[PDB]
Amino acid sequence: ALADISGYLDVLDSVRGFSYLENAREVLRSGEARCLGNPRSEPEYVKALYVIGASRIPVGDGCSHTLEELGVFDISVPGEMVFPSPLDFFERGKPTPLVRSRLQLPNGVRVWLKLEWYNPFSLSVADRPAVEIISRLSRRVEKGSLVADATSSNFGVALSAVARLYGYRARVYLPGAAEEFGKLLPRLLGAQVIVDPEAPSTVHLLPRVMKDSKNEGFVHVNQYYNDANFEAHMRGTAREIFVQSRRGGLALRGVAGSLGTSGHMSAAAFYLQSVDPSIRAVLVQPAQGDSIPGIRRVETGMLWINMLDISYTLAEVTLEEAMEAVVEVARSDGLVIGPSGGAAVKALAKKAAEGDLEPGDYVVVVPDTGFKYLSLVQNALE
Numbered sequence: 001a002l003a004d005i006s007g008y009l010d011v012l013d014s015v016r017g018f019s020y021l022e023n024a025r026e027v028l029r030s031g032e033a034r035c036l037g038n039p040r041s042e043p044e045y046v047k048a049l050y051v052i053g054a055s056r057i058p059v060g061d062g063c064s065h066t067l068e069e070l071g072v073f074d075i076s077v078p079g080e081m082v083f084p085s086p087l088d089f090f091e092r093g094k095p096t097p098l099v100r101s102r103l104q105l106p107n108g109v110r111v112w113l114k115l116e117w118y119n120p121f122s123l124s125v126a127d128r129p130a131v132e133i134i135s136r137l138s139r140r141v142e143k144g145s146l147v148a149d150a151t152s153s154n155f156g157v158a159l160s161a162v163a164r165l166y167g168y169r170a171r172v173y174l175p176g177a178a179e180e181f182g183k184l185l186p187r188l189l190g191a192q193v194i195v196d197p198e199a200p201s202t203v204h205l206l207p208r209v210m211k212d213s214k215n216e217g218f219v220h221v222n223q224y225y226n227d228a229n230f231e232a233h234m235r236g237t238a239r240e241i242f243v244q245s246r247r248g249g250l251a252l253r254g255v256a257g258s259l260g261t262s263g264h265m266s267a268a269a270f271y272l273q274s275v276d277p278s279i280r281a282v283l284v285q286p287a288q289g290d291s292i293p294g295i296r297r298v299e300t301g302m303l304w305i306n307m308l309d310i311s312y313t314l315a316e317v318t319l320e321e322a323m324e325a326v327v328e329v330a331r332s333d334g335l336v337i338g339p340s341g342g343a344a345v346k347a348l349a350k351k352a353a354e355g356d357l358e359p360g361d362y363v364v365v366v367p368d369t370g371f372k373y374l375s376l377v378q379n380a381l382e
């Protein structure tokens, strides 16, 4: 019989490396987890279960339990949408909406958009890694210390709100070309903001962040390499697409999305593909020469999408093409999705047009809201 996982989460602080995901994939493939003779002597297996989304764990002799029995499918949300705190709302106010699009794509590819602007701090996907990283920091690092990172915009905004709800000071480093909401809103949120107008990308800032961290002794949370990014997406974003697709009665044939740290799509793909390895992952390549906010080309360096055993496909997409998918989704659905969203929609549309895709439902992860990108919106129209 079962035990609340929340008493066992010291395994987050102690387990290392990716060998535990084997456990994660077999539990997802089989549909069950075998009973832990000693729960504390299998800290890997407990971490596989956290990661996939269990609220409970099987303890003692023999009895294997299903995914449902472990809490993967438990409803977190209160019917009435009342929450005692903004962090309780982040955590229990899930899943984000999965919304079937009116947008018509060729060869029977049915589009569902998963709306990641429904996260309360940055109105973006990047609330999830920021809550998980700052949560895990909270055991080891003293309140009032400074946490910092490089961002395209969204993670710093999230990092800033979250560090503050956990009693930490925050500093965010942006490239000059970053959107204005990423430069301004950390400050509103009580953080320090450094902008480098020469730094042509956001990863080019990391050597400075790392140098500064050495001198000034702040905590570089480094979303690019920190496994609590991938983990936050595994138990939120990915588990959600699984549970929603099942519970929605979807013929889930694939996922489409976009790549910054690679956290969210790495998890989406790895998770779902543990369940059914034929589920496709369609991934945006920002066409060379172009900048699509928040995202980049794979070969500029992304951890999880290269180290984990994930099957994916790329589809190159230009800024112009992305903003064109933003316009189309707006006129089809009345939903105003941001640039990286419309790149993912487009990449899905490119592959369906090629006849590569098995007819059925595909879930596009929409990282944020287009209200944050008016300049780009205005250029797309003129």
Ligand SMILES: Cc1ncc(COP(=O)(O)O)c(/C=N/[C@@H](COP(=O)(O)O)C(=O)O)c1O
Residues within 6 Å of the ligand: 124, 125, 126, 150, 151, 152, 153, 154, 155, 156, 202, 203, 258, 259, 260, 261, 262, 263, 264, 265, 293, 294, 295, 296, 338, 340, 341, 367, 368
């Ligand atoms: C609008 C938007 N779309 C997609 C992504 C990609 O999510 P990830 O791959 O899980 O980081 C992000 C992630 N942004 C992160 C990472 O940015 P970066 O990898 O430097 O281009 C940030 O805000 O610093 C985003 O802001």
